[PDB]
């Protein structure tokens, strides 16, 4: 039948902020998950409960691609049971996560000389996220004992932080494009199969 549209996912011109990470549903198609790995321009390719070259003789109901931009020293957080601002307040992977985590450096697309302020991440939250939750709220965060009345001030800080990517940052502060593939097998006709 038709080919899975991973090219739209991986080669998308725009990538979401991690606090507002994007989920695409892959369905009714044939996917060569080897040809994904074969494009050996990925600095991170960690799979969980599955492996490339085995995804080609496997069928699933739905495949999810979550995509976003973070920074280099935060890639290590895009993994199950990790802690930190990204894993807690932006994007949590469950204990039973089954899929692959693919990231790569995007300094050439996502930095700007004055700094890029389009890419944001949440720095503060009253409670840790649950696996695969998304929080897009913009309410001022009360870091202190007094209320904030919808307005910034002492201990009253707008939670989203700007990455401010610039080409001259050290590697750990450069933008990385991340794609997390999650494979789900409901009790239903499988519709995403490898060529096998």
């Amino acid at each position: 039948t038709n080919l899975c549209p991973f090219g739209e996912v991986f080669n998308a011109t725009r990538f979401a902020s991690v606090y507002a990470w994007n989920r695409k549903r892959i369905s009714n198609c044939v996917a060569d998950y080897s040809v994904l790995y074969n494009s050996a321009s990925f600095s991170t390719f960690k799979c969980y409960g599955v492996s490339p070259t085995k995804l080609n003789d496997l069928c699933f109901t739905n495949v999810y691609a979550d995509s976003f931009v973070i920074r280099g020293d935060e890639v290590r957080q895009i993994a199950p049971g990790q802690t930190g601002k990204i894993a807690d307040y932006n994007y949590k992977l469950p204990d039973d996560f089954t899929g692959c985590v693919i990231a790569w450096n995007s300094n050439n697309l996502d930095s700007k000389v004055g700094g890029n302020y389009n890419y944001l991440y949440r720095l503060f939250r009253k409670s840790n996220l649950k696996p695969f939750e998304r929080d897009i709220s913009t309410e001022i965060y009360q870091a202190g004992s007094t209320p904030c009345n919808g307005v910034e001030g002492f201990n009253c800080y707008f939670p989203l932080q700007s990455y401010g990517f610039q080409p001259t940052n050290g590697v750990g502060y450069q933008p990385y494009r991340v794609v997390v593939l999650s494979f789900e097998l409901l009790h239903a006709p499988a519709t995403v199969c490898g060529p096998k």
Partner: antibody
Amino acid sequence: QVQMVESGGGLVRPGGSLRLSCAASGFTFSDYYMSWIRQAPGKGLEWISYISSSGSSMNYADSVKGRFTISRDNAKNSLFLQMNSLRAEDTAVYYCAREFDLTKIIMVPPYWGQGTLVTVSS
Amino acid sequence: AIQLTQSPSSLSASVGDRVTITCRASQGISSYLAWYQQKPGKAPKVLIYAASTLQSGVPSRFSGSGSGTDFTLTISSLQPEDFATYYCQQLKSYPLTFGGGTKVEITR
């Protein structure tokens, strides 16, 4: 030693444009909210603008919204104020000020530059 | 926008006298208050932050008190070099706002 040095002041045509610059040192710049405050000859202190530490939020007093824009460059330890459609009421000494430290939760004293005078005159 | 009401707008007093300046906030601002000193042709400088903490350097003649809506700046023994205009600043919430100032002259 906290240092905040402003520059770019001087004479601007009524209706023209001027860009102020505030250079900072002695503290991790990217941790602090910053503000522009101005004082007209003989008058009191008027706050006009703030930018959050990372540049994700900013706001303006009403006398200045639509005409001015604040910005910062955390790589260069620099705050900026772009000023457009200037008029006689805008003649003042313009100060830059470092305020809240989102890194901590303890109240810290603000720190101000020395001022620079912009005169809006033909 | 929190409004601050500073009193008095000017005063004169002799060397060694006690000088008291007050600020009234249109809302509770608990302790989120600074007091500034501005000498002639200089930039405002913080004397007290958090309503009552002395900035380094500042002589201990200066002190502040209050919490909520009513704050007080005290110079316990006015000295000649204390000629200045003093301001209170609310720090609870942007847009930051100031009192009108208190010109302090010395009687001689």
